[PDB]
Amino acid sequence: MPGTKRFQHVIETPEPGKWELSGYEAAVPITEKSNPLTQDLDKADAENIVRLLGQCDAEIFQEEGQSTYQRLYSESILTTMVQVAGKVQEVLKEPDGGLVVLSGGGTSGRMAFLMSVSFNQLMKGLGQKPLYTYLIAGGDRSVVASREGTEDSALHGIEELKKVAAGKKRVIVIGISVGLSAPFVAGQMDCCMNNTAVFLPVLVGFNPVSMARNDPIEDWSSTFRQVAERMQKMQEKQKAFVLNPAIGPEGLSGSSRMKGGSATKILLETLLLAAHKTVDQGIAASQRCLLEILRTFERAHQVTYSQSPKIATLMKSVSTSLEKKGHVYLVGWQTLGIIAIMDGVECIHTFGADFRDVRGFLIFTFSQEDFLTSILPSLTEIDTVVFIFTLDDNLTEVQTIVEQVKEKTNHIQALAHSTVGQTLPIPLKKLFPSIISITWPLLFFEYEGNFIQKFQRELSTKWVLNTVSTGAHVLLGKILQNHMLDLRISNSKLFWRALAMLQRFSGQSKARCIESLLRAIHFPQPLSDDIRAAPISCHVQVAHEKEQVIPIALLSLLFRCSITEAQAHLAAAPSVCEAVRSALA
Ligand SMILES: O=S(=O)(c1cccs1)N1CCN(c2ccc(C(O)(C(F)(F)F)C(F)(F)F)cc2)CC1
Ligand SMILES: O=P(O)(O)OC[C@@H](O)[C@@H](O)[C@H](O)[C@@H](O)CO
């Protein structure tokens, strides 16, 4: 038929009660599953949400049981991290004609950037020439922008890589895709494998290779699964590597900004920090060095979620601030300001939130006597400002701003990263009665700016901000069980997530769900044969511009009615979410 081939890889909708036994669930990639821990997340109160997402993040560190998917601590994973640390070494010995690229779209690309700076600092600090760089879907503007459409081109990924790979002679390309999903990455990896004598591809994600994407990429002939299958074969001869531990599903299904983002830093900082630290020692990096690092990162989680109660509250002040239709501000210094920006940008696509609903500031990059003049005026009784900084920062730069924001705002609150027994100047910092002090042990540090202390803090902030931003919106009633139904379809992956969600909630056939989705997307145009057979980017591009696409499609299905009828029905309910919930009853 027309469209049959575009949709060929979609498994049919199981008959009720047979979701398990048709083998459908076993086909859903780990990264997209519903985490059972979060089945009733739309009901958790602020303190549970914090617990539940604390539990989900912990799974990053959970070990392998006895037939089952390998994990962060399995010896096949750590061995591979050893081998890779190793290849990063060769390059560090030959900094002339040498380069190391970290690449991904979306948050994988953000993570890539963060880590390229750090590992560039570290080499600067020893007056070694910088070898790291990053690549993000849609260039550097993407690092601080919501730009979900940019990941779909394999040729774009190959372009951006051909740029930075110059006339260099040894290139390590660490391609990052939580889902083993992004076409951007796929093309980089396939390119690398064509020119081994220069390129070393290393692929980082969190699905087994047999769950890697196998739907066709519009500008490329092989799929992600093929590329990854072939990289795995090459690993036997140490010419490619696949680093792909399971870490369990995301608390909000498919939200790979969360665990996926964290596991990415954890996995790669670990392995890179080891690479360097063991070079000047003139010793092979070993599982033992990595493990120290990993266990530090696993302490970091326990440390970080010690502050759960105060985390829950900061979430409550954010929820109400956004219920009351206010705005929310995150202000922070050095890399923690960045991480702030990042969390706020992600709320746009992740929740259909406006770019002011939760905004991030660095000292986006709006300075002391700047933020005070421009942003400060328009704050309000109902708003919330959040301060994120270490005590090794300019605390006089800090207090000024809090002195000032105590004017319009009262719901402030802060996130203070001390190394133990640093005190916190002004005991009149009962500006924040119950701050979020997170205090870090003393450690042994050789390298420059105590990089492990950076990674810990960064990671803990990400955990905090993410849990908080995600937490706020669930509380608002905006999530359905642990799914975001009402997403904006802005790339092919989200198109598939939409379709899958229509099948899950309607229980109706694949062909009906596809029909309702394409009708909803293209309304008022009807299903022509061209539209049915069009490449998925055609639907993406049109859907990207609409509102309530997925709920209208689900409604069409549940009432077994038309798009005109479901739109009118929706317009008649108090809100999207009641329309949907009601219709499920
Ligand atoms: O090819 S994909 O783009 C892909 C991306 C990454 C690796 S492969 N596509 C695979 C299937 N997929 C999905 C999503 C949700 C469900 C759900 O059934 C429900 F729709 F309900 F969300 C579940 F989460 F509940 F399990 C099922 C399947 C989304 C993405
Ligand atoms: O790392 P992947 O699977 O290639 O995902 C790449 C991006 O889609 C992903 O980071 C996305 O932008 C975030 O919205 C996830 O909440």
Side-chain angles (χ1 to χ4, degrees), residues 15-60:
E15 293 304 290
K18 312 197 177 154
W19 278 82
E20 263 291 297
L21 301 97
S22 75
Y24 180 105
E25 238 99 14
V28 170
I30 290 163
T31 66
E32 301 277 333
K33 287 190 208 290
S34 141
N35 193 140
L37 301 177
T38 46
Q39 269 151 156
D40 295 305
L41 181 89
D42 54 353
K43 291 156 178 192
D45 79 16
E47 268 79 27
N48 292 311
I49 290 167
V50 171
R51 187 179 42 88
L52 285 180
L53 306 176
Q55 256 160 223
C56 293
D57 298 3
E59 293 175 328
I60 297 170

Side-chain angles (χ1 to χ4, degrees), residues 23-24 59 120 126 139 177 212 243 248 323 365 424 439 464 499 506 554:
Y24 180 105
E59 293 175 328
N120 278 328
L126 335 177
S177 195
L243 266 165
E323 192 179 19
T365 176
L424 215 194
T439 163
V464 177
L499 187 60
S506 73
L554 186 59

